[PDB]
Write a protein that binds this ligand. Sequence first.
Ligand SMILES: Nc1ccc2cccc(O)c2n1
Ligand SMILES: Nc1ccc2cccc(O)c2n1
Ligand SMILES: Nc1ccc2cccc(O)c2n1
Ligand SMILES: Nc1ccc2cccc(O)c2n1
Ligand SMILES: N[C@@H](Cc1c[nH]c[nH+]1)C(=O)O
Ligand SMILES: N[C@@H](Cc1c[nH]c[nH+]1)C(=O)O
Lengths: 419, 419
Amino acid sequence: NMVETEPVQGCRDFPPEAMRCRRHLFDVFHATAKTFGFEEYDAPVLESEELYIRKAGEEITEQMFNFITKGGHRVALRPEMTPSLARLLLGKGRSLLLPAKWYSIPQCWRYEAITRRREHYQWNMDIVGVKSVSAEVELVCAACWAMRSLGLSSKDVGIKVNSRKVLQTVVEQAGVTSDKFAPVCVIVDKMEKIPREEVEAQLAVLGLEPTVVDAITTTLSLKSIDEIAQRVGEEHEAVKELRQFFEQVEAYGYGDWVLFDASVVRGLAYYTGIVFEGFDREGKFRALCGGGRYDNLLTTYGSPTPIPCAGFGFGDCVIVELLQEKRLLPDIPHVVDDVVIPFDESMRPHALAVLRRLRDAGRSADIILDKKKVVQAFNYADRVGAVRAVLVAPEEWERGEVQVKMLRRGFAVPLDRLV
Amino acid sequence: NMVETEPVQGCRDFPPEAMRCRRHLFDVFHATAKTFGFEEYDAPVLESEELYIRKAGEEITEQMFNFITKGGHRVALRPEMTPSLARLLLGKGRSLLLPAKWYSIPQCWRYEAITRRREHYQWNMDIVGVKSVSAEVELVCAACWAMRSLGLSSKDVGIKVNSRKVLQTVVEQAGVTSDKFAPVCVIVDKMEKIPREEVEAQLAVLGLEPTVVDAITTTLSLKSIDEIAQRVGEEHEAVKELRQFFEQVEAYGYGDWVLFDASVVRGLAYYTGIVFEGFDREGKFRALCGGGRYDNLLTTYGSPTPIPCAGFGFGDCVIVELLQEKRLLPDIPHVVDDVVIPFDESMRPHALAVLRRLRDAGRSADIILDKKKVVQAFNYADRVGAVRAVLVAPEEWERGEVQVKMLRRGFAVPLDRLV
Ligand SMILES: Nc1ccc2cccc(O)c2n1
Ligand SMILES: Nc1ccc2cccc(O)c2n1
Ligand SMILES: Nc1ccc2cccc(O)c2n1
Ligand SMILES: Nc1ccc2cccc(O)c2n1
Ligand SMILES: N[C@@H](Cc1c[nH]c[nH+]1)C(=O)O
Ligand SMILES: N[C@@H](Cc1c[nH]c[nH+]1)C(=O)O
């Protein structure tokens, strides 16, 4: 009998070759988070289904990987991290010191009728307790920093930015009760990649008249902040905020990375203010990352006081395709410093003591574990990219030495000199 | 309405405080693996239930966290990593270069009728393609290395070691067909922590006579390798192997960490040779880690040629309790190098440029994001353990300077000198 060697439908294996690629990326996510002063957290991949019941026609909750425990409890593999984060924050209450800057790199999950990936890793960064656009500034700079760290430039990618408050106004001024607003953002998010007829249809389903639909479409196609200003005023808070945002990003030195786009809304119900989305400037890939401000979610979860929040998620799949296309993911193979080679099996104990010493000195080192010829041991050393082979032979050992060969003739060296 | 702030039954939250503890541990697991030349891998937490159907009464497979997809597919959250590893190895075939030394730190899962933890993280280390006890030597040394790295000594803990081949002989020589052997190990593993009557009963259920049961119990209580040698001969391969194992561990310098214990068998069906288990020398905690040789598993999975393997798993929960008891987990709080403080909001752009510079130089740095008084900014700096506060004020800025205050009076410094 033969076991199924392929992973479960829509899930990825990470043998060493693929793991090095993932590690290269996560190392940047971690390093960027540390540079920016964010704290790591984590929570269970398994959460209560109840945590995601938002009733706004979101794709994320529609495609929920859910099931029922033997105990009858309705659960899901998390489709996103933000609800888990909020649960932790709400759990802490007044004991949480603010501001708080928390990051994680959870695997998140989806399930579709179409048998597409069902899992991905998503770097999450969130700032909690900060009212002003400085939070969004910092988050957008963090995302650019990560991409620049990966070797991309502002010629390769950007982050396009908007605020939902502009549309909020239009919807409210058009006589539509604010309860329809989140559903509208969800529908209008689809504007980009499906027919306008199909989107207009969906909005009409919500009970909004053609004239109201009109204003929405128009405001999505406005190309500048000044044209927004003409539409809603120069001190509509949206304008002041976006200007402050762009000014602050410019002062940090990432002005070439960011721009305004009135069509950016995102697909999540809970964004209340600034929203943003990373993209490739060749128009070839899906969104690289996405985020925004969500000031009401915690109130929504039963927080007795409103807690301002903003953040983003940054997936592991699209960024990697982009990097591959741009030839910014060279395979650096697995490597070690030293390979210790017993001359024969009688030298194994001596070679072990040498191994101990090298590792004690902070070196990465292998020892040849099987019985083999010296030449094969050198073949192995080359396979693992050793800087150095350390041959432990009877002759040198009697002199208190080993034979060392730099791989990146051969020379006898006292034990103490090795390290 | 209030959302449930507690995590799902039997699952842990990792807010920053708990995450630092976990990170401290994983950092050792990673560092130890690199020191020993192991390669990282990963696979999906979700695997086919079929992968674990071993039919040997194992607790691990009995307590399987399984469910059925909407597609009707029988799946589980992995109870262990070793089957996933084997799937990857079998998937590679002849293209896998040997030897291979692979590690991972998967979250693994269980489900019980008793509502105990249902998840844990388990450092896995495995050596593939090595016939000789040198593999086991290296794995046991790796486990000790990790524990010593965490600040434990050979007075605190040990690893007790045995080989199943001794018992294999007894079972086979007693006329019991080898198919009963794995089930027997599974039963005898329970010997330790349940009544002997209850264990003897279970073996009788398998159809083994009282005389055969007798020999098993006796051999479990033999206290030395010499007494095993008297029982099965000095060149029963078990004896030679254990002697070689102990000799090699002694030569690496971890002789005080290891010992022989004829009662150690482990609960897993697939161990064929040497097996081992980490323990605390005060007899206070459950097993810290556990592993062994499993030379038949890949054959069992349909590998057309036998592939030798050995490894262990090292849980994240018991080790941490031990470390807490031993006071080896001091809370090091979250820290940053620098906190940049705008004197007021008019200095925010200048302060951002300063932030850019510090981060460009590899420093971890925050900027005060909200509007606040300088004194509050210093309170925040103290909260995040900054080495340095960098006050960006109009006066100094006009001189091309900032004001720097070492936290671990205050002095003006040119921008360029900061880094
Ligand atoms: N929300 C999710 C959850 C899981 C995903 C897997 C692959 C790609 C995605 O965009 C995913 N999005
Ligand atoms: N030991 C090292 C260190 C760095 C290396 C870079 C590329 C290829 C190698 O084999 C390397 N080996
Ligand atoms: N096999 C497993 C799988 C999950 C576990 C969770 C907590 C403690 C354990 O010993 C576990 N063992
Ligand atoms: N920046 C640092 C660096 C090291 C520290 C150690 C303990 C407490 C601290 O606040 C520390 N802050
Ligand atoms: N949860 C969002 C990203 C995000 C993090 N924080 C705020 N938003 C998503 O999956 O797109
Ligand atoms: N899978 C084993 C540990 C192990 C890893 N490799 C071999 N054995 C366990 O969970 O106990």
